[PDB]
Amino acid sequence: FTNVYADSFVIRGDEVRQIAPGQTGNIADYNYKLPDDFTGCVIAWNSN
Amino acid sequence: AISSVLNDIFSRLDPPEAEVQIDRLITGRLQSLQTYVTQQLIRAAEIRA
């Protein structure tokens, strides 16, 4: 691939489902929008 | 499909899955247009003869 935009943040486990294409929620409305033509792979890691 | 009004199909569902029913309404209207052009063209050979 040409270039990667790595977006790293920490969030609670209640709002970890909303990081998805075509989703509405707390992060997905006004904080972080993800488009429908997205290509890549997101990962999750609990840090309790 | 679930509906025949296009914007109608859309104004309810999620665009990861709202885009898949509308292309079914494309090729449903396309294959009826394939039958209409073919029935005009066999009738084109009959009226030319």
- Contacts with B, A 1-48, CB within 8 Å: 21-22, 36
Helix-then-strand count for chain B, H and E: 2, 0
- The C-alpha atoms of residue A4 and residue A16 are separated, in whole angstroms, by 22
- The C-alpha atoms of residue A11 and residue B20 are separated, in whole angstroms, by 32
Distance, in angstroms, between A37 CA and closest chain B CA? 10
R_g (Cα) of chain A, nearest Å = 12
How far CA B22 is from CA of A23, A41, B5, B49, in Å, comes to: 20, 28, 9, 41
Q: Do A36 and B16 touch (CB under 8 A)?
A: yes
- The C-alpha atoms of residue B49 and residue B43 are separated, in whole angstroms, by 10
Helix %, strand %, coil % of chain B (to 5): 80, 0, 20
Contacts of A10 (CB under 8 A, 6+ apart): A47
Helix %, strand %, coil % of chain A (to 5): 10, 0, 90
* A7 within 8 A of A43, measured Cβ to Cβ: no
Resolution (A): 3.7
Neighbours of A33 (CB within 10 A): 11
